[PDB]
C-alpha cells in the first residue's frame, strides 16, 4: 500500500489548501520519557472539503508550491 | 565508466591491493561501489595470495564495467580454479 499519516486540521483559510498538525509520540533520548511532538504540514486539497478542527489522512506527492508536498486522501472525523 | 580495479591499501614497501568496482573518475583509494576481492602480491607462499569473487565480477561486466590490466591478469590467473 502507500505510506500515509493522520493528523488534524490546524487552520483552514487558504485557497484550495489546508495545514495539518501531526502528533508523533517520541521517547526523549536522554531522559526516557515519551513526549508528544508535532509536525505542521502544508497539505493540498482540491476543492477544499475539510474545514478546521477535522482529522484527515495525508500522503506525500510532488511539490505543489513552496513547502506543500502533501495531499489528502480521506477526511475522517469532522465533528464540531 | 565503472571499472573493476585495484586500490593500494597495505603499508609502505608492502602493498596489499583490494580489487573494487568504482566509478572510474573517483580517486584510487576513494569511493567504490563494491569491493569484490583482494590481491596480495606477497602474502607468503602459503595458500592463496588472491581471492576474487567471480560471480560479482561477471555481474558487473554484464552491466558494462571495464576491467584494468591487473584485474584481467588475475582473472587469467585464477581462471576457474587455477
Amino acid at each position: 500500500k502507500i505510506r500515509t499519516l493522520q493528523g488534524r486540521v490546524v487552520s483552514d483559510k487558504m485557497e484550495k489548501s489546508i495545514v495539518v498538525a501531526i502528533e508523533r509520540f517520541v521517547k526523549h533520548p536522554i531522559y526516557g520519557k515519551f513526549i508528544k511532538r508535532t509536525t505542521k504540514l502544508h497539505v493540498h486539497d482540491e476543492n477544499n472539503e475539510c474545514g478546521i478542527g477535522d482529522v484527515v489522512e495525508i500522503r506525500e506527492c510532488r511539490p505543489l508550491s513552496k513547502t506543500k508536498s502533501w495531499t489528502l486522501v480521506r477526511v475522517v472525523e469532522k465533528a464540531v | 565508466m565503472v571499472t573493476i580495479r585495484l586500490a593500494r591499501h597495505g603499508a609502505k614497501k608492502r602493498p596489499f591491493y583490494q580489487v573494487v568496482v568504482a566509478d572510474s573518475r573517483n580517486a584510487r583509494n576513494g569511493r567504490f561501489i563494491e569491493r569484490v576481492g583482494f590481491f596480495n602480491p606477497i602474502a607468503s607462499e602459503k595458500e592463496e595470495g588472491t581471492r576474487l569473487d567471480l560471480d560479482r565480477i561477471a555481474h558487473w561486466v554484464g552491466q558494462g564495467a571495464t576491467i584494468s590490466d591487473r584485474v584481467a591478469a588475475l582473472i587469467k590467473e585464477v581462471n576457474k580454479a587455477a
Binding site: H28, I30, Y31, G32, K33, I35 | -
Partner: protein
C-alpha cells in the same frame, strides 16, 4: 530534578574558564618585558620577588614571575612566558622560561637543571 523539568530545561554546568589568558591557549608566548620589578608577597611570607611586566605578542600586557637565583633581564630582553601561578604574589599568573630567547639559564646550578635552562656541566 523532576524529569519533566529537565525536558523543559536541561542541566547545564558552567564553563570553568582559564587561569591563563596566554591567548588561544598556546603553551608559551613571547613578550618584551616592559619593566622589571621586585615585589613583596602576601602576609605569611616575606621576600622580594623578582617579577617582570611584559607586553606579549598578542597584545596583552601581563606580569610574570622570574624563577631561580638571579637573572639578566632588563626592559627589552624578549622572553618566553609559560603559564603557572605564583600564589604568594597577588596577580602574577605566569612564569618566564629560563633558558629561552633572552633569558639565560640559572648560574651555577646542578639539580632540577632542565627547569632552569642550564646545560649539563662537562665532567
Amino acid at each position: 530534578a523532576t524529569v519533566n523539568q529537565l525536558v523543559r530545561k536541561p542541566r547545564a554546568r558552567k564553563v570553568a574558564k582559564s587561569n591563563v589568558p596566554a591567548l588561544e591557549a598556546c603553551p608559551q608566548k613571547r613578550g618584551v618585558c616592559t619593566r622589571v620589578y621586585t615585589t613583596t608577597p602576601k602576609k605569611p611570607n616575606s621576600a622580594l620577588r623578582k617579577v617582570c611586566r611584559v607586553r606579549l605578542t598578542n597584545g596583552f600586557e601581563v606580569t610574570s614571575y622570574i624563577g631561580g637565583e638571579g637573572h639578566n633581564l632588563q626592559e627589552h630582553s624578549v622572553i618566553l612566558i609559560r603559564g603557572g601561578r605564583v600564589k604568594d604574589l597577588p596577580g602574577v599568573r605566569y612564569h618566564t622560561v629560563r633558558g629561552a630567547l633572552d633569558c639565560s639559564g640559572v648560574k651555577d646550578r646542578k639539580q632540577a637543571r632542565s627547569k632552569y635552562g642550564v646545560k649539563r656541566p662537562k665532567a
